[PDB]
Amino acid sequence: EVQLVESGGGLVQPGGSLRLSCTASGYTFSHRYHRWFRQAPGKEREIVAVISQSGMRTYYADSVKGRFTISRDNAKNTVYLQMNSLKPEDTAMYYCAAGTRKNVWTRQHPFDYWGQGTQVTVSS
C-alpha cells in the first residue's frame, strides 16, 4: 500500500512556528521530489516548497522564503516543512506530495503520494 502520511499542523499565533512532516510508505521516498503546497478556502493553491530527492535542491515560494524550510530525512522516509514566523496569510490546509522534478504529482497513482493535508491556522 502506498501512502505519504502527513502529520503536524494546528493553530498558532502570528510569529509562531510549526513543523509539518510526511512519511512515505510503500514507495521509495528517496526517489522522489517532495513538495508542500497549501490551499485556503478563498485563496488558490500554492506550492510553497520543493525538495529534490537527495535534498540538495530546495525551492520556495517567495512569500515563505526565509520563514519556511523544507527538509527531508531519507533514512526516516520523511519530508519536513518547518514553518517559522507564521503569519495570518499562512493560514491554509498544507499538503505534502511526492512528485517529479517537474511536477507536484507523480505521473500515475498520484493520490498515493499525497498527504491527507493538515490545517495550519495563524490567528489574526
121 class by beta-carbon count within 10 Å (0-12 exposed, 13-18 middle, 19+ buried) = middle
Rounded to an integer, what distance in angstroms lies between the CA atom of residue 122 and that of residue 79? 22
Overall number of domains in the chain: 1
Residues making up the chain, counted from first to last: 124
Domain with 25 in it: 1-124
Rounded to an integer, what distance in angstroms lies between the CA atom of residue 60 and that of residue 20? 15
43 class by beta-carbon count within 10 Å (0-12 exposed, 13-18 middle, 19+ buried) = exposed
**CATH code where residue 59 lies:** 2.60.40.10
Rounded to an integer, what distance in angstroms lies between the CA atom of residue 111 and that of residue 107? 10
Order of strands across the sheet that contains 78-83? 3-7, 18-25, 78-83, 68-73
Instruction: Kindly provide the resolution of this structure in angstroms, with one decimal.
Output: 1.8
Q: Which amino acid is at 102?
A: K
